[PDB]
Amino acid sequence: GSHYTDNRYKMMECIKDAGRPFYPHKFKISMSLPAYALKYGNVENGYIDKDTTLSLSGRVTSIRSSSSKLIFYDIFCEEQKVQIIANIMEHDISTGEFSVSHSEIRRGDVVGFTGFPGKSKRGELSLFSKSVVLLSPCYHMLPTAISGLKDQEVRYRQRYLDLMLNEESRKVFKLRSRAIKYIRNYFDRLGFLEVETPMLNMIYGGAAARPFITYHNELETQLYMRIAPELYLKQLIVGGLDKVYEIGKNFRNEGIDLTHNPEFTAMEFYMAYADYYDLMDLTEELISGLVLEIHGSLKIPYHPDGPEGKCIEIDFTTPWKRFSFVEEIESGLGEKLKRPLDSQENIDFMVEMCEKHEIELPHPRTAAKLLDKLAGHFVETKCTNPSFIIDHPQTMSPLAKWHREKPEMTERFELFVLGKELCNAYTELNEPLQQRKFFEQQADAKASGDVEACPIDETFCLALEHGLPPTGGWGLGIDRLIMFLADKNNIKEVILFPAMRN
Amino acid sequence: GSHYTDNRYKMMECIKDAGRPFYPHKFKISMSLPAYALKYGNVENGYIDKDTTLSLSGRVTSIRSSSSKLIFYDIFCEEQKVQIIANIMEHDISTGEFSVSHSEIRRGDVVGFTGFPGKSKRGELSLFSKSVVLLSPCYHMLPTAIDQEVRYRQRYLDLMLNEESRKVFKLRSRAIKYIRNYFDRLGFLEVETPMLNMIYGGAAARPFITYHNELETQLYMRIAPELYLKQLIVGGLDKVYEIGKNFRNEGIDLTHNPEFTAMEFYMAYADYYDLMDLTEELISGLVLEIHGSLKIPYHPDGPEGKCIEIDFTTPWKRFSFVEEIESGLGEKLKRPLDSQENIDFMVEMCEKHEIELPHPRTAAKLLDKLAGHFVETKCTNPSFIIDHPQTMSPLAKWHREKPEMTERFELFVLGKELCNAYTELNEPLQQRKFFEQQADAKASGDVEACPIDETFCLALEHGLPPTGGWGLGIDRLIMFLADKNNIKEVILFPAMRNV
Ligand SMILES: Nc1ncnc2c1ncn2[C@@H]1O[C@H](CO)[C@@H](O)[C@H]1O
Ligand SMILES: Nc1ncnc2c1ncn2[C@@H]1O[C@H](CO)[C@@H](O)[C@H]1O
Ligand SMILES: N[C@@H](CCCC[NH3+])C(=O)O
Numbered sequence A: 001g002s003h004y005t006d007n008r009y010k011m012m013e014c015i016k017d018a019g020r021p022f023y024p025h026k027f028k029i030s031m032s033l034p035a036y037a038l039k040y041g042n043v044e045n046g047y048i049d050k051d052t053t054l055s056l057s058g059r060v061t062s063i064r065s066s067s068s069k070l071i072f073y074d075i076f077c078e079e080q081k082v083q084i085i086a087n088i089m090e091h092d093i094s095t096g097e098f099s100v101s102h103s104e105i106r107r108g109d110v111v112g113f114t115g116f117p118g119k120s121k122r123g124e125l126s127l128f129s130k131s132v133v134l135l136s137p138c139y140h141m142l143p144t145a146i147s148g149l150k151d152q153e154v155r156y157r158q159r160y161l162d163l164m165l166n167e168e169s170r171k172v173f174k175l176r177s178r179a180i181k182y183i184r185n186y187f188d189r190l191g192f193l194e195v196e197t198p199m200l201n202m203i204y205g206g207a208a209a210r211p212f213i214t215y216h217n218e219l220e221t222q223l224y225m226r227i228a229p230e231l232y233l234k235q236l237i238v239g240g241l242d243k244v245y246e247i248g249k250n251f252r253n254e255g256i257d258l259t260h261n262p263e264f265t266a267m268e269f270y271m272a273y274a275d276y277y278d279l280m281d282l283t284e285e286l287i288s289g290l291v292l293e294i295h296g297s298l299k300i301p302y303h304p305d306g307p308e309g310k311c312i313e314i315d316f317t318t319p320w321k322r323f324s325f326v327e328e329i330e331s332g333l334g335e336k337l338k339r340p341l342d343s344q345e346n347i348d349f350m351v352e353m354c355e356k357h358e359i360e361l362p363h364p365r366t367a368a369k370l371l372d373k374l375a376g377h378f379v380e381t382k383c384t385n386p387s388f389i390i391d392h393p394q395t396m397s398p399l400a401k402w403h404r405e406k407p408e409m410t411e412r413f414e415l416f417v418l419g420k421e422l423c424n425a426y427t428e429l430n431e432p433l434q435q436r437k438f439f440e441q442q443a444d445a446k447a448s449g450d451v452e453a454c455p456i457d458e459t460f461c462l463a464l465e466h467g468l469p470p471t472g473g474w475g476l477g478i479d480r481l482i483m484f485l486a487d488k489n490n491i492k493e494v495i496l497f498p499a500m501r502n
Numbered sequence B: 001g002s003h004y005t006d007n008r009y010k011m012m013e014c015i016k017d018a019g020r021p022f023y024p025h026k027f028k029i030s031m032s033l034p035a036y037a038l039k040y041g042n043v044e045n046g047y048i049d050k051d052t053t054l055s056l057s058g059r060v061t062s063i064r065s066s067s068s069k070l071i072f073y074d075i076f077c078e079e080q081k082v083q084i085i086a087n088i089m090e091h092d093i094s095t096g097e098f099s100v101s102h103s104e105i106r107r108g109d110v111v112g113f114t115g116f117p118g119k120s121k122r123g124e125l126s127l128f129s130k131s132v133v134l135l136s137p138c139y140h141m142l143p144t145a146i147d148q149e150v151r152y153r154q155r156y157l158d159l160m161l162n163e164e165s166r167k168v169f170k171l172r173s174r175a176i177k178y179i180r181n182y183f184d185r186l187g188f189l190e191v192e193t194p195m196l197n198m199i200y201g202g203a204a205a206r207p208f209i210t211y212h213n214e215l216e217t218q219l220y221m222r223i224a225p226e227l228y229l230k231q232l233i234v235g236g237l238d239k240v241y242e243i244g245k246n247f248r249n250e251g252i253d254l255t256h257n258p259e260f261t262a263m264e265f266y267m268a269y270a271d272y273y274d275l276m277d278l279t280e281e282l283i284s285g286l287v288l289e290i291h292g293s294l295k296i297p298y299h300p301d302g303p304e305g306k307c308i309e310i311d312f313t314t315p316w317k318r319f320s321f322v323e324e325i326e327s328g329l330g331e332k333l334k335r336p337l338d339s340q341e342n343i344d345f346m347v348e349m350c351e352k353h354e355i356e357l358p359h360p361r362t363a364a365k366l367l368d369k370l371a372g373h374f375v376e377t378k379c380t381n382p383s384f385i386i387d388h389p390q391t392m393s394p395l396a397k398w399h400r401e402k403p404e405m406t407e408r409f410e411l412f413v414l415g416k417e418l419c420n421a422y423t424e425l426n427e428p429l430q431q432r433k434f435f436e437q438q439a440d441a442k443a444s445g446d447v448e449a450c451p452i453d454e455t456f457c458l459a460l461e462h463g464l465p466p467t468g469g470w471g472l473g474i475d476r477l478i479m480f481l482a483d484k485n486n487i488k489e490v491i492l493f494p495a496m497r498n499v
C-alpha cells in the first residue's frame, strides 16, 4: 500500500537515471480506441495487417504473461477496450530489451503501444505490438471496480477514481450534457437570447434563500453571491430583449442533503407577454419533450431507495395535476385558515396547527414561513407524479403578480416531482408601488431574523418605474432534473465534485 | 423630472380608482411586430383590411397628436417599429371616451392596440386602431437617444434606446455558440466544476473569501477551474471543456472585471504545439464567420477616433519569452532565472528602463514585468508569447529542449492577454515542489500565490495522461470581435465604482 507507492517512485527514479523514457511530452496516436474498434472490430479471427503500423494509447486495465515471450495487455480509453499482444519476436530493440521494457509497466499506468492491427485467433480485437512506452505511471494499487474502494465517499472525494472505474458514473455526466443541450436548443428555436448576469452583487435577491457574503478589497464593498439571477433578468425585459434565458450557478448558504448542494445549476427564462398559464403549458411541453427524448416514453423508472430497492414509475403524461396551495392545506387541516393570511390571528392559528400536527415550527414565525411548513406537510407530499402547486399567497411571493381572481394569492406555481421542487414560476409583478411594499415587508422579516428574506433593491424598483411589460418568468433546478432523468436519489451523483461534510 | 414621476403615480391612482385598466395581467398579441411587418409590409399604399382585427403591442417611441381627432403613435418591439393611427371615428367607446383613453398614454409606455392592418397613404406600415390599453407605464421622461455611466448603471436604458448595445449582446451569444459547436464537433464533453472550494488555485490572483455557516468552513471563490478539470482527465473523460465565471479580487480597468467569463479545455494526448494550431483555427474561423475577413477594424480610442487593423491571418507570430526580453535589454538575464543574482539583476533592469517594480520582488513577478514592457507591447496582431520560465509557470510541463523553460504560450492581441495554455505538468514530484515554492511565496507576502493543493497532488499520483490545456478570456474576445475598448461594453451589468 504505502510500500507500493514508495517503490513506484523508486522505479521511476531508476528509469530516469537509466536514461529511459521518463514522462514523454508527446505521444502521437494514430486513432482513438473507438475509431480502432470501428475500423478493425469485424475482421476475421487471426487477421493481422503487417503493412500498417499504428500507435494507440490508454490506461492499462489488465496484464498477463502466458510465457517469457508473450504478454497480453488490455488498455481502455474513451469507453473502448483493446487487447495488446506483445510477442518478443516483434519487439523493436531500439526501444530497449523486451523484458526491461515490459518490467516497467503496471496495471493502472497510462501507456502507448505501436504495432499491427487485427484480431487474435481467439477473436479478440488486438494490436500486435512492437514497442511500449510508459507515458504516466499510476503510483497506487487500484481496485478493479468501485466496490473495491475504501468508502463509497471515495467516489465523491476522488471523483477521478469513480470515473476511471465506473461506466455508470461517466454515463450520468454525458446525460447531463445531453439534457442541457436539448434545453438550449428548445429555447434557441423559440428565438430566446442567452445572457449572463452577475454572480457577485452589492444586493442579493430573487429567492427565499440565505446568501454567501464576500468582500471586494479595492472597491471597499461587501458583495453577495447571487441566490438567483431574477432581478437582473427582468431588467433585460424592461430593456426590450423580449425573450432571455440564463443557465448557471446559484449559491445558497444552507444545509446539504440529498437534494441540496450549496452551489447548483439552475436556469431562468423571462418571456414578455406570457402569464403563468402560458408558463405551465411550456413547462409541460419542455419537460415531457426532454423525458421523451431520453427515455422513449413519458413513464420512466425511479429507484427512490437506491438501486438495491423497489422500482416505481413516474408518469410525465400531460396535462399535470394542479393543487391549489391554500385549499389543499385547508383540506389537510379540515378547517380554513384565518384571513387575512398574514394577520396575527392567522399566524397564531398556524402555529397551533403546526403543533397539533407535529410540524416543526420555522423561525422566525412569519406567516410566509408558517404557510411554507404547512404546504410541505400537507401538499408537497401529494406530488408523486409531476404536479403543479399553484396560487401561492402574496405574503410568501414578494415578486409574483397578484392573482387576477383570488384575493391574497399570486399567479405563481411550483412544479414538484416525487415531493421535491423542480420549478418555480410566475406572472411577474410589474407594479412598482406594490413591489416596494413587498420589499419592505421582506426587509422587516430579514431584520426579525429570517435569514432567507431579502433586502429592498432600489435599483430594481427604479427599473420597474421604466416599465416592465406584462411578463412571465420561470426557473428550473437542473441538477434535480438530472436526478430524475438519470434515476439517482442523491444529488452528489449528478455533480462532479459535490460538497462534502468535514 | 421629480414632478413628472409623482404626477404619473397620481395618474395611475386615478386610473385605478376609476376602475379603468390598471396593469392588465395578460395581453394576447395576434402576432409579433416583425411578423406584422413581414405580412403587410408589401401591401399597396393606403391599403386597409377592415375585415381583419389584430392586437399588437410594444413600447411607445413617439406620439404625435396632429389634431383633436387623430393621433399617430410609433411602437417598437423585437427590433420592429410599427405606426399606429388612432382616429376618433374608429374608437371603441366601450373602452372610454377617445380623449380619456389617449390622455393616459405617454412616450415610453408599454401599450397594446387593437385595430385594422394596412399602410398609410404616405406608405407607412400602420395599424388603424380601435382601442388602446396601457399595459405598463414609464414614470420617467426618457431621452431620445443615449452621464454615459448611465448606460452601465441602468443597462435597461441602454438596451431600450441604443440598437448598437443590443447588437453587442447578440454577437456575444453568437460567438459563444460558435465556440461550443467547434468543441462539440471534436467530441468534447462540457462539464461544470465548483466555484466554491476550501482552497484556490490554477492562476495567479487574489481570491474572494466567503463562509459556509452550516459547515462552519471558510471558502474561496475559484480563480480558475484548472485543477478540477485535470482530475477529469485522470478520470478518463479525455476531452472536456468548461465555460463560466472566474472570480478575482483585484482592481477593475478597461480589460478587468472582478467576475469574468472564461473557457478552459483539456485534451488528452495534445501538447502546446497542438494547442497553438487549434487556437489559430478556432479564432481565425470565428473572426471570418463574424467579419467575412481576417483583417478587422479596431478603435482603441472610440468610434470617432483612429481606426487600426488587426490581422488574424495564419500562421501567427511567435515570440520566445526570454529571448525577446533579452533582445529588448540588449543583454542576457542571469541563470538560474530564479537565483537571487537574477532577481537583483532584474530589479536593476526595471529601474534602468523605468519599469514599476512588483511586490514582492519574486523572480516570477519581475519576469512578468519585463515581459509586459518588452514583449507584450509588440503583440498588435494576435501573437504567441511562448516558452515561459518554470518559475512563473508552476503547472506547466518542463520544456523538452530548453532548460528552465516550460511548454507554455500566451496569446496576446493589441497588447492584451487572450489565451494562456500549456503542455500540462503530469509529474507529481515536480508538481509538489512548485506548489511548495508557491506556498513559500504566499508566506513571503505574494497575495497572488496559491497554497499547496494536496488533493491535486494525489490525483496526479493516479496518472494524468500527457495532456494539453488551454484558457480563453471570453469577454476580451468579444471586445475585439465587437470593436469595444472597454470591457464594460461587453458585460451586461459590469462592476462600477461604488461612488
Ligand atoms: N441547494 C439546492 N441545490 C440544488 N437544487 C436546488 C437547491 N435549492 C433549490 N434548488 C432547485 O433550483 C431551483 C432554484 O434555482 C429550485 O426551483 C429547485 O428546483
Ligand atoms: N479580471 C479579468 N477580467 C476579464 N478577463 C480577464 C481577467 N483576468 C484575466 N482575464 C482573461 O481570462 C483568462 C483567464 O481566465 C485570461 O487568459 C484573460 O484572457
Ligand atoms: N428566482 C426564482 C425562479 C424564477 C421565478 C419566476 N420569476 C427561484 O430562484 O426559484
Ligand SMILES: N[C@@H](CCCC[NH3+])C(=O)O
Pocket: B202, B203, B223, B224, B225, B226, B264, B420, B421, B422, B424, B469, B470, B471, B472
Ligand atoms: N488556468 C489558466 C488557463 C489554463 C492554462 C492551461 N492549463 C488561467 O487561468 O490562465
Ligand code: NA
Pocket: A317, A318, A319
Ligand atoms: Na399530453
